[PDB]
């Protein structure tokens, strides 16, 4: 059944299995909510992804 | 155990160094992809129904979070299916031929019969012809 | 008394000192998971009319409490019916071919038999003609 994917698709499973489980691991919505309280009090937002 | 077997080959093709968005990926939360995401479950069924996708497909479509992956389960499943409704019409069409062969074979030789029926009656009416002229 | 035959064996592999976490598998109160759970629930009830699905395994569906347990029990009957459905049809297929196949030789067996019957009445015609010679 991957003879009919293509290159671009293979890519795009491959990045939304890494995105899909890292957002649900870390919970990653609770991690931008925090970021938003910064945006108002602040104007600043600001993430390390390492 | 997060990624596939073709999803972790995909680190030996080279240059995956370079950023998703150079290879024509974006992370997209907008109308547009919501938009696509709603008309690809609503085809998804519509083609449930009607007999064109199976209930194994369409379990793999609502655990995909890809638009293109359930994209190409539709794709993979429509050509499945109409490659096997396509050789069912031709074994149905042969079926009714090999049955037209049958019933032709045995009526020529029905044919081939009732010639060599006839023609024993006709030289055996040359042997009694023959014997009572002695 | 609270898991399964299967359930009880993972612990016999080496991988349950580390997190769930590292294999996959996290806890999800999201509308990802709940609209899952929506959407196996409804196939469930498709698939239960038109003959798609048991009762015997919706029963197993409700007290399932596994997205992905209820998600390999519908797979698991709708192959059980495609495969009984495709056997039914070959059966009646070879059905209506092993009797247009004994009405062929039982026309031949007519077809046989005249060309034997008259052959005899030849036969012995000539017996016939010897005798009233002498
Ligand atoms: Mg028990």
Same mark, same amino acid.
């Given at each position: 059944?991957?003879?009919?994917?293509?290159?671009?698709?293979?890519? @795009?499973?491959?990045?939304? @299995?890494?995105?899909?489980?890292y957002?649900?691991?870390?919970?990653?919505?609770?991690?931008?909510?925090? #970021?938003?309280?910064?945006?108002?009090?602040?104007?600043?937002?600001?993430?390390?992804?390492? | 155990?997060?990624?596939?077997?073709?999803?972790?080959?995909?680190? @030996?093709?080279?240059? !995956?160094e370079?950023?998703?968005?150079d290879?024509g990926?974006?992370?997209?939360?907008?109308? #547009?992809?919501?938009?696509?995401?709603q008309?690809?479950?609503?085809?998804?069924?519509?083609?449930?129904?009607?007999?064109?996708?199976?209930?194994?497909?369409?379990?793999?479509?609502?655990?995909?979070?890809?638009?293109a992956?359930?994209?190409?389960?539709?794709?993979?499943?429509?050509?499945?299916?109409?490659?096997?409704?396509?050789?069912?019409?031709?074994?149905?069409?042969?079926?009714?031929?090999?049955?037209?062969?049958?019933?032709?074979?045995?009526?020529?030789?029905?044919?081939?019969?009732?010639?060599?029926?006839?023609i024993? !009656?006709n030289?055996?009416?040359?042997?009694?012809?023959?014997?009572?002229? @002695?």
């Amino acid at each position: 059944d991957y003879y009919t994917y293509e290159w671009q698709d293979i890519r @795009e499973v491959r990045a939304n @299995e890494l995105l899909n489980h890292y957002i649900k691991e870390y919970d990653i919505p609770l991690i931008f909510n925090n #970021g938003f309280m910064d945006a108002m009090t602040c104007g600043e937002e600001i993430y390390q992804c390492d | 155990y997060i990624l596939s077997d073709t999803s972790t080959r995909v680190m @030996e093709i080279d240059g !995956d160094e370079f950023a998703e968005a150079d290879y024509g990926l974006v992370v997209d939360n907008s109308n #547009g992809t919501q938009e696509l995401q709603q008309k690809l479950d609503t085809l998804a069924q519509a083609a449930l129904q009607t007999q064109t996708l199976s209930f194994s497909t369409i379990t793999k479509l609502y655990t995909s979070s890809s638009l293109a992956e359930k994209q190409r389960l539709i794709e993979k499943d429509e050509k499945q299916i109409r490659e096997r409704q396509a050789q069912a019409q031709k074994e149905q069409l042969e079926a009714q031929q090999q049955i037209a062969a049958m019933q032709q074979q045995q009526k020529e030789a029905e044919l081939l019969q009732k010639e060599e029926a006839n023609i024993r !009656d006709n030289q055996t009416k040359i042997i009694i012809a023959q014997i009572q002229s @002695e």
